């Protein structure tokens, strides 16, 4: 098995920023060589063969050079839809071998989230059970606390919290907090509340509603 | 134009088996060579190995000869993947890809179209559909000209659901979060929408949710 090797890892860089990784081969591979983008949630995607060859419909922004055992892709300009990981896989031969990619990543500037809170559904309340769910929607950076409160006291109990990958749009994450009560022990309170704290925010920002109302 | 779909995914039991399939369309299936790739969750790309247009040569990775049989029926333009005994090593998202770009009298190809995978568990728990519940647009998700709408599908296993809106025809600021595993071992998870705030009342908006390990298929309409 040849083994590849990919440096950097992962990287961080701005939009508008060159790009540069590199690919090792444990030996010489000629110009069998290929390159793969891997969006956050996504199948891999081809986007260069035989070293330096474009795949159809792949941006001119993307390059790849190199011959034997050292190969470099390159980004000229980079693009918030760039977000991914890239592989390396040599074609020269059996078994055919990825190498362990390289995660890129997108610094922006300090985006605050907007806040939006929701009640348990009547539907759901029917089932003997109340998920509350407050969303922290595209923020940066990915840092953020969100405290649970309710009639004015704070809630140490069932919440769960869950981050997106960046967006291939504006390079943001959301996050959303889910608060799981029995519909007995979400009747015994009448304000829920969750209270957001981002750098984007010059205080911390409190999102409530009345049960029932 | 190409297009490659897996299905076959869900739960296995450690030493069981499953045969996984990739229906195809686009393109002659007879004249390319069909290959399959693994990811395990948050790790790389792993070859598995490749099928020829008249499986007359068909190669693996040394390492997996034992737990994969690859297959093919040109007829019905589908690639097959037997799963043989697999041990908890080999818990992967399976895609099946399309060489192409192939060598003059040289065993070369670039992997040129990939199915969207399919994630094989490997456990000894059961299988359990999801619960769908709405996250209603309010003025308490509301933020000017922008409202925010979801959904909840909630207690599955194993994963993976998707999460599609108004049948595909709605993907602008769609968020579907990473599952989460409650307390009762089942899966959780939230798909949001920032749509315009006027749209609330005159616009339709549906989630469409399935979890193909149990063949649940839910649509449910959001409603503010």
Redesign the interface.
Same mark, same amino acid.
């Given at each position: 098995?040849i083994q590849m090797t990919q440096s950097p890892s992962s990287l961080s860089a701005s939009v508008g920023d060159r790009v540069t990784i590199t690919c090792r081969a444990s030996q010489d591979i000629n110009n069998?060589l290929?390159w793969?983008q891997q969006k956050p949630?996504?199948? +891999?995607? #081809?986007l260069i063969?035989?070293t330096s060859?474009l795949?159809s419909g792949v941006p001119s922004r993307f390059s790849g050079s190199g011959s034997g055992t050292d190969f470099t892709f390159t980004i000229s300009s980079l693009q918030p839809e760039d977000i991914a990981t890239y592989?390396c896989?040599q074609? %020269?031969t /059996? !078994?055919?071998?990825?190498? @362990?990619?390289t995660k890129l990543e997108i610094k922006r500037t300090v985006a605050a989230p907007? =806040?939006?809170?929701? +009640? !348990? &559904?009547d539907? @759901?309340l029917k089932?003997g059970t109340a998920?509350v =769910?407050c /969303?922290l929607?595209n923020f940066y950076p990915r840092e953020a606390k969100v405290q649970w409160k309710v009639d004015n006291a704070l809630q140490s109990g069932?919440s769960?919290?869950?981050?997106?990958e960046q967006?291939s749009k504006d390079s943001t994450y959301?996050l959303?907090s889910?608060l799981?009560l029995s519909k007995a022990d979400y009747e015994k309170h009448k304000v829920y509340a969750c209270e957001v704290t981002h750098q984007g925010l010059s205080s911390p920002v409190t999102? &409530?509603?009345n049960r029932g109302e | 134009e190409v297009q490659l779909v897996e299905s076959g995914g869900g739960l296995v039991q450690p030493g069981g088996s499953l045969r996984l399939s990739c229906a195809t369309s686009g393109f002659d299936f007879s004249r390319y060579w069909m290959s399959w790739?693994r990811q395990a969750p948050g790790k790389?790309? =792993?070859?598995i190995?490749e099928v020829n247009p008249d499986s007359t040569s068909i190669?693996?990775? +040394?390492s997996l000869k034992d737990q994969f049989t690859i297959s093919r029926d040109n007829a019905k333009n589908t690639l097959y993947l037997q799963m043989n005994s697999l041990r908890a090593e080999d818990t992967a998202v399976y895609?099946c890809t399309r060489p192409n770009?192939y060598?003059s009298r040289?065993?070369?190809?670039?992997?040129?179209?990939?199915?969207?995978?399919t994630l094989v568990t490997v456990s000894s728990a059961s299988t359990k559909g999801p &619960?769908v519940? *709405? /996250?209603?647009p %309010?003025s308490? &998700?509301? %933020?000017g000209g922008?409202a925010?709408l979801?959904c #909840?599908v909630?207690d599955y296993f194993p994963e993976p659901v998707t999460v599609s809106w108004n049948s595909g025809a709605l993907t602008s600021g769609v968020?579907?979060? *990473?599952? =989460?595993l @409650?307390?009762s071992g089942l899966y959780? /998870?939230?798909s949001?929408v920032?749509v315009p705030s006027s749209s609330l009342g005159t616009q339709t908006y549906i989630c469409n949710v399935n979890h193909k390990p149990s063949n649940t298929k839910v649509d449910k309409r959001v409603e503010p």
């Open positions: 098995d069998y290929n793969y949630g996504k199948a +891999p995607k #081809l063969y035989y060859r795949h592989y896989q074609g %020269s /059996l !078994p055919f071998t990825f190498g @362990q990619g907007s =806040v939006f809170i929701f +009640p !348990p &559904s539907e @759901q089932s998920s =769910v /969303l929607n069932n769960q919290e869950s981050v997106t967006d959301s959303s889910t799981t999102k &409530s509603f | 790739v790389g790309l =792993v070859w190995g190669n693996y990775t +040394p895609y770009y060598g040289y065993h070369y190809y670039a992997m040129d179209y990939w199915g969207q995978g &619960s519940f *709405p /996250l209603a %309010s308490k &998700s509301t %933020s922008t925010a979801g #909840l909630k968020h579907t979060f *990473p599952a =989460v @409650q307390s959780s /998870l939230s949001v920032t």
